[PDB]
């Protein structure tokens, strides 16, 4: 194609404008600043509660903002809202489609979303008039499997699907408001910033972008990984995030420095990381691998603090409460282990 | 107080409302075969049917895209993957069915699943053997040095030149199947026929053959 092979090279000439100024703004590394503070040690967490209610493998899980209730979606076709203090169930919602890949609990506590291979985000109303759990809306705009969804409030919800797009919905009108195009591979997980004005999204092209909710533009793109991204989570101040992938490596990126800081890899670990999450202070980076165990990483020294291995099958999710009190882990056996 | 022990008691009584429902739904889930139709409600295309008081559950995944390395991990707890293959500017689609089969057969999460593959549209192929003046061994050059196996059932009407081209593709999937399958999961090759009351029975007789081999490996008799 004429007047195009220079355009393909004008992009690679402009990526060299990125990667030299991104290198010129690297005074040191995250290791040799940190190496004066002393580490935490062996963090021996124990299974407190074990939630035995599903039938098939569990893909997702999301805590509530009171840090007491938690949704878990499993691919038997049902969605169960637990109670983490006393192991008893408060709801059990029969889904229409059996292959559910995500779930969310609204920050007010009134709504629960889900979604999967039916390409539809389904909103459920927990505080209805007569007393039931019936479908409020069915957000049908995506042309691919829905992999993650998170509420901003009770009115709007941002989703990420396997059609390489993210979308900002509006549950009252049922239709999209802003779509977020720009990824090349299937977007697997998003994570909201704490101020809910920005979010990031890791996809299967080894690149996690950064989106702006009110405008709809991708501000900056983070490429440090080798293989497909399976998880994402903000550092709790809103200026960094960690990124799990299939090359058995977490990477703590930074927004203002605009590049990777640290690399959480150990050579005895070869299998991919299903999910990631920080603690309340951000010192610990927990990360569930494709192997049946969960590894705590000290997110500043990049040394493995502790290992939490209470699962008989690959963990499919990972969630730390808003008060930081416990850690819930789900897996492909029908079990939710709560750790602290 | 009495009041906090009053709704704590009503919270535990919500278990018996739904743990009785979970045991009600555990019965219908375990006696239902979940299959997977993939060939080589707008997105999952679920299909229920009933063969001799046995519930089946099909899933057609045509509503998705074609980078299937992520959503195929959902389908590990299925009993069998039904894998239809069209036998037919020659795009070489038949090798594409071999490489997709080789990736399912070697996937880490799909190392326990048998494949029921239907070699389809031999009526389109039995014309293209005679009407093709050259051969279609230009794509498979190891076809001239291949003979029909003796333990074969050549149905009449088709030439042995068509029978040789029909069983060569079947052995080409078993050369992938028997390379690394090591007894955990097998392959059940078939040929498509009149669909009503004869093609679903081949799925039914193979899904008994998978579960009867499944328990016999739990008892280590196979």
């Amino acid at each position: 194609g004429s007047e195009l092979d220079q355009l393909r090279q004008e992009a690679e000439q402009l990526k060299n404008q990125i990667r030299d100024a991104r290198k010129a703004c690297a005074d040191a590394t995250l290791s040799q600043i940190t190496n004066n503070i002393d580490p935490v040690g062996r963090i021996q967490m124990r299974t407190r509660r074990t939630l035995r209610g599903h039938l098939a493998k569990i893909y997702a899980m999301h805590w509530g903002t009171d840090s007491r209730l938690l949704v878990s979606a499993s691919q038997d076709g049902k969605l169960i809202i637990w109670d983490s203090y006393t192991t008893n169930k408060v709801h059990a919602i029969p889904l229409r489609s059996s292959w559910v890949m995500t779930c969310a609990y609204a920050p007010s506590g009134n709504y629960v979303a889900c979604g999967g291979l039916d390409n539809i985000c389904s909103i459920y109303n927990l505080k209805t008039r007569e007393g039931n759990v019936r479908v409020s809306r069915e957000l049908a705009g995506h042309t691919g499997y829905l992999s993650c969804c998170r509420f901003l409030d009770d009115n709007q919800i941002v989703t990420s699907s396997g059609d390489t797009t993210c979308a900002l919905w509006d549950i009252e009108t049922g239709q999209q408001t802003t779509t977020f195009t720009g990824h090349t591979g299937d977007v697997m997980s998003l994570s909201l910033a704490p101020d809910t004005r920005l979010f990031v999204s890791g996809a299967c092209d080894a690149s996690a972008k950064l989106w702006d909710v009110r405008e709809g533009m991708c501000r900056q793109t983070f490429t440090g990984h080798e293989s497909d991204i399976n998880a994402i989570c903000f550092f709790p101040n809103g200026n960094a995030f960690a990124t799990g992938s299939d090359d058995a490596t977490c990477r703590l990126f930074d927004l203002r420095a605009d590049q990777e800081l640290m690399t959480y890899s150990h050579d005895n670990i070869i299998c991919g990381i299903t999910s990631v999450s920080f603690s309340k202070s951000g010192r610990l980076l927990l990360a569930g691998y494709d192997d049946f165990n969960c590894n705590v990483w000290d997110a500043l020294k990049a040394d493995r603090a502790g290992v939490l291995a209470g699962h008989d099958n690959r963990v499919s999710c990972l969630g730390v409460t808003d008060d930081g009190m416990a850690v819930a882990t789900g897996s492909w056996d029908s079990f939710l282990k709560i750790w602290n | 107080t009495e009041d906090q022990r009053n709704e704590e008691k009503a919270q535990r009584e919500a278990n018996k409302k739904i743990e009785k429902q979970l045991q009600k739904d555990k019965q219908v889930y375990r006696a239902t075969h979940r299959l997977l139709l993939l060939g080589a409600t707008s997105g999952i295309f679920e299909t229920k049917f009933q063969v001799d008081k046995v519930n089946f559950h099909m899933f057609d995944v045509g509503g998705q895209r074609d980078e299937r390395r992520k959503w195929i991990q959902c389908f590990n707890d299925v009993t069998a993957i039904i894998f239809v293959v069209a036998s037919s500017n020659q795009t070489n689609r038949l090798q594409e069915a071999l490489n997709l089969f080789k990736s399912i057969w070697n996937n880490r999460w799909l190392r326990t699943i048998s494949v029921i593959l239907f070699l389809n549209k031999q009526d389109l192929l039995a014309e293209k053997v005679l009407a093709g003046k050259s051969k279609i061994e230009d794509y498979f050059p190891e076809f001239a040095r291949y003979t029909t196996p003796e333990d074969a059932t050549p149905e009449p009407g088709e030439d042995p030149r068509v029978t040789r081209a029909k069983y060569f593709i079947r052995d080409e999937f078993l050369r992938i199947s028997t390379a690394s399958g090591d007894g955990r999961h097998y392959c059940y090759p078939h040929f498509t026929c009149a669909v009503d009351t004869e093609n679903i029975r081949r799925v039914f007789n193979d899904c008994r053959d998978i579960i009867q081999r499944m328990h016999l490996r739990q008892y280590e008799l196979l």
Partner: nanobody
Amino acid sequence: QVQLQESGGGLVQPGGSLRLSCAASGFTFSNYKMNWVRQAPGKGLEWVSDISQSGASISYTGSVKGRFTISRDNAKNTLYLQMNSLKPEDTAVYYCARCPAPFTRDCFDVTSTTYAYRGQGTQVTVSS
């Protein structure tokens, strides 16, 4: 960034030989299952040849068996494809891909115009 920059490929009469090579950059090259993908004009993307994580297991399309030989040099991080005795219907655009995970044997890569870990293309033209 995972980048696959490739060279080689040009005008050649049928019977002649070429040599393609993509020097990979941005990942550990010794952990992935590299492979070549072909797209003829008017046709879909088509698989050509595999190579294992070290060089043990080698596969081919049947229509290129015996003519093409694939090679991997781990120390220089590049992937060779030695083509002998070209055909006039082998004129296409050749891509080198990789299988998306380390230490695996399965691959999902001969797909549509969207795929992440694929080179940009080298034109190979066989005519007279």
